[PDB]
Every structure is written in structure tokens, then in C-alpha cells.
Design an enzyme around this catalytic site. Structure first.
Site, PDB file in Angstrom:
ATOM      1  N   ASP A 126     -18.620  56.951  29.808  1.00 51.54           N
ATOM      2  CA  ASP A 126     -19.372  58.140  29.366  1.00 51.54           C
ATOM      3  C   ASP A 126     -18.485  59.380  29.453  1.00 51.54           C
ATOM      4  OD1 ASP A 126     -22.722  59.366  30.422  1.00 51.54           O
ATOM      5  OD2 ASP A 126     -21.616  59.681  28.551  1.00 51.54           O
ATOM      6  N   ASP A 156     -26.853  73.113  20.641  1.00 54.68           N
ATOM      7  CA  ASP A 156     -25.798  73.377  21.627  1.00 54.68           C
ATOM      8  C   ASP A 156     -24.438  73.436  20.962  1.00 54.68           C
ATOM      9  OD1 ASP A 156     -24.520  73.855  24.031  1.00 54.68           O
ATOM     10  OD2 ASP A 156     -24.823  71.808  24.823  1.00 54.68           O
ATOM     11  N   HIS A 206     -23.597  76.001  25.677  1.00 56.77           N
ATOM     12  CA  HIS A 206     -23.777  76.079  27.125  1.00 56.77           C
ATOM     13  C   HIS A 206     -22.451  76.363  27.841  1.00 56.77           C
ATOM     14  CE1 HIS A 206     -22.840  71.653  27.751  1.00 56.77           C
ATOM     15  NE2 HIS A 206     -22.415  72.126  28.911  1.00 56.77           N
ATOM     16  N   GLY A 252     -17.460  68.917  32.840  1.00 54.08           N
ATOM     17  CA  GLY A 252     -16.110  69.364  32.542  1.00 54.08           C
ATOM     18  C   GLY A 252     -15.648  68.911  31.168  1.00 54.08           C
ATOM     19  N   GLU A 264       2.235  73.931  24.776  1.00 49.25           N
ATOM     20  CA  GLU A 264       1.063  74.782  24.880  1.00 49.25           C
ATOM     21  C   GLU A 264       1.126  76.016  24.000  1.00 49.25           C
ATOM     22  OE1 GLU A 264       2.977  73.890  27.594  1.00 49.25           O
ATOM     23  OE2 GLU A 264       1.628  72.892  29.015  1.00 49.25           O
ATOM     24  N   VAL A 273       0.185  71.910  34.565  1.00 49.45           N
ATOM     25  CA  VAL A 273       1.638  71.994  34.436  1.00 49.45           C
ATOM     26  C   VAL A 273       2.008  72.468  33.032  1.00 49.45           C
ATOM     27  CG1 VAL A 273       3.849  70.705  34.516  1.00 49.45           C
ATOM     28  CG2 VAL A 273       1.947  70.071  36.072  1.00 49.45           C
ATOM     29  N   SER A 287     -17.816  69.049  28.673  1.00 49.45           N
ATOM     30  CA  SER A 287     -18.719  69.789  27.790  1.00 49.45           C
ATOM     31  C   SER A 287     -17.973  70.607  26.767  1.00 49.45           C
ATOM     32  CB  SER A 287     -19.612  70.734  28.583  1.00 49.45           C
ATOM     33  OG  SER A 287     -20.476  70.011  29.431  1.00 49.45           O
ATOM     34  N   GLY A 288     -18.498  70.605  25.544  1.00 42.35           N
ATOM     35  CA  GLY A 288     -17.905  71.381  24.458  1.00 42.35           C
ATOM     36  C   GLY A 288     -16.838  70.630  23.693  1.00 42.35           C
TER      37      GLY A 288
HETATM   38  N1  LIG Z   1     -23.447  62.039  30.826  1.00 43.46           N
HETATM   39  C1  LIG Z   1     -22.913  62.901  29.972  1.00 43.46           C
HETATM   40  N2  LIG Z   1     -22.448  62.436  28.810  1.00 43.46           N
HETATM   41  C2  LIG Z   1     -22.826  64.361  30.333  1.00 43.46           C
HETATM   42  C3  LIG Z   1     -23.608  64.892  31.362  1.00 43.46           C
HETATM   43  C4  LIG Z   1     -23.495  66.249  31.686  1.00 43.46           C
HETATM   44  C5  LIG Z   1     -22.606  67.066  30.996  1.00 43.46           C
HETATM   45  N3  LIG Z   1     -22.497  68.385  31.307  1.00 43.46           N
HETATM   46  C6  LIG Z   1     -21.836  66.538  29.967  1.00 43.46           C
HETATM   47  C7  LIG Z   1     -21.947  65.192  29.636  1.00 43.46           C
HETATM   48 CA   LIG Z   2      -0.028  72.022  30.329  1.00 40.74          CA
END
Ligand SMILES: NC(=[NH2+])c1ccc(N)cc1
Ligand SMILES: [Ca+2]
Length: 223
Positions: free
Chosen positions: A171, A84, A40, A175, A62, A57, A177-178
Site C-alpha cells: 500500500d 483531494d 490535504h 508521507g 536535484e 543527500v 500523500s499527493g
Molecule cells: N493506506 C493508504 N493508502 C494511505 C493512508 C493514509 C494516507 N495519508 C495516505 C495513504
Molecule cells: Ca537528494
């Protein structure tokens, strides 16, 4: 990451940021030329950013390397988020060192109860929005399949697991994700989805990486 802690610069050396003018997803370096992320997170024009702590920064460790190709899992369903997972190849091999290092693929699937490390530059708030500039970390257990399915009726496939805390407060989030879920030094999960973030009875849902090792190895062998 909601309710986590500041990792410390370059303490999660396999963590990458995917950048298309801005950070948009995490990923995990699995060898010098390949990154695992969430399907995704797919888009064209990805630059992989390794060795990052503060993503705003230039701090000195890097490596920025453009992707040459991306391969979304052949059975990825964007509606259900089943499968996914995607692979991203770097145009050139990263220089591996103590701060930029690959993470091993699992040899075995992790169990409910195993503690893992989840990390990312995603939102740190369950209500509203705040993005950190440095990498955030969360230690969290894998939850039982039964509790996962009970939390998300009709939504959990054999390619997903839950991890986190049913009480809420801790949790992954938008942002993240992945990005990686690492347990006993192996990449067992990919940040995939959830209801909001850190909500009671709505734990994080993660791609079950152990199901994909054969596909990953074969894909890398021919691309
Ligand atoms: N709650 C979660 N772990 C979560 C929800 C949305 C998402 N894009 C990534 C993680
Ligand atoms: Ca940096």
C-alpha cells in the site's frame, strides 16, 4: 510505501517532493512550471524538489524551486476528502531532461484491473514508523468500484478509486500523500487516504485525476 521496492535513482522522473524544511508530501510534475498534488497537502511556503532520490543527500540531479502559488480544488472537502487535488506553480520553469520530466494527463479514465505505479518517500511500515531516504515504488492494480465501496461503506465518491491488494501488505502510506499513481504512462491517481496502511480489506484510496483534466487545463491556462 509499504511492501514496495526501491525504485532506483531518477527512474520516476515526474515524482517531486514537497518541502517546507522537511519532506511532507509527494507531487507530480505535469509541465515545466506546474505540479499536481493532494489538497490535504496544502500549506504555505512550499519548495518543490525535483530530481530527487535520497531526500537527505544532495546527489547531483536535484532542482529546488519555490512555489509562487497554490490552488486547492474549488470543491475540496477536507472532512470527506472529496476532490483531494491541488495545483502548485513553480516560481521558475524546471529544466526538463531524462531525470526531471513531466507526466501526461489522462485522455481517458483508467479501468479496474489496470496495473499502475505508485511511488513516494512515505512510511514503509504498517505497524510503527520507518521513513526511507530513497524513493520507493509499488505496482498495484486499480480495484473495482464495488470492492472499493464495500471496503469503505459510505465513503467512496465518484472522484475516488481504490488500488492495491485486499489481502494487505502492499500500500501507500503517511508521507506518500499527493504523490502519483501512473498507469500506462498517464497520471491517473493521487495518493489520498486509507485506513492505516496495508491493512487487510483497507486498500489505498486515490483521487481520480481523469475527472479533473478540464479544471487542470483551464487553471493552468489562466494562472
Ligand atoms: N493506506 C493508504 N493508502 C494511505 C493512508 C493514509 C494516507 N495519508 C495516505 C495513504
Ligand atoms: Ca537528494
Amino acid at each position: 510505501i509499504v511492501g514496495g521496492y526501491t525504485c532506483g535513482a531518477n527512474t520516476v522522473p515526474y515524482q517531486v517532493s514537497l518541502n517546507s524544511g522537511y519532506h511532507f508530501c509527494g507531487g507530480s510534475l505535469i509541465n515545466s512550471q506546474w505540479v499536481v498534488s493532494a489538497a490535504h497537502c496544502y500549506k504555505s511556503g512550499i519548495q518543490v524538489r525535483l530530481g530527487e532520490d535520497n531526500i537527505n543527500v544532495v546527489e547531483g540531479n536535484e532542482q529546488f524551486i519555490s512555489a509562487s502559488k497554490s490552488i486547492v480544488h474549488p470543491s475540496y472537502n477536507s472532512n470527506t476528502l472529496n476532490n483531494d487535488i491541488m495545483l502548485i506553480k513553480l516560481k521558475s520553469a524546471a529544466s526538463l531532461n531524462s531525470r526531471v520530466a513531466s507526466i501526461s494527463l489522462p485522455t481517458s479514465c483508467a479501468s479496474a484491473g489496470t496495473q499502475c505505479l505508485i511511488s513516494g518517500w512515505g512510511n514503509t511500515k504498517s505497524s510503527g514508523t520507518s521513513y526511507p531516504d530513497v524513493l520507493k515504488c509499488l505496482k498495484a492494480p486499480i480495484l473495482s468500484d464495488s470492492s472499493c465501496k464495500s471496503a469503505y461503506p459510505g465513503q467512496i465518491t465518484s472522484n475516488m478509486f481504490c488500488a492495491g491488494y485486499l489481502e494487505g501488505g502492499k500500500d501507500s502510506c503517511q508521507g506518500d500523500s499527493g504523490g502519483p499513481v501512473v498507469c500506462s504512462g498517464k497520471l491517473q491517481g493521487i495518493v489520498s487516504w486509507g485506513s492505516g496502511c496495508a491493512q487487510k480489506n483497507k486498500p489505498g484510496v486515490y483521487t481520480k485525476v481523469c475527472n479533473y483534466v478540464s479544471w487542470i487545463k483551464q487553471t493552468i491556462a489562466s494562472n
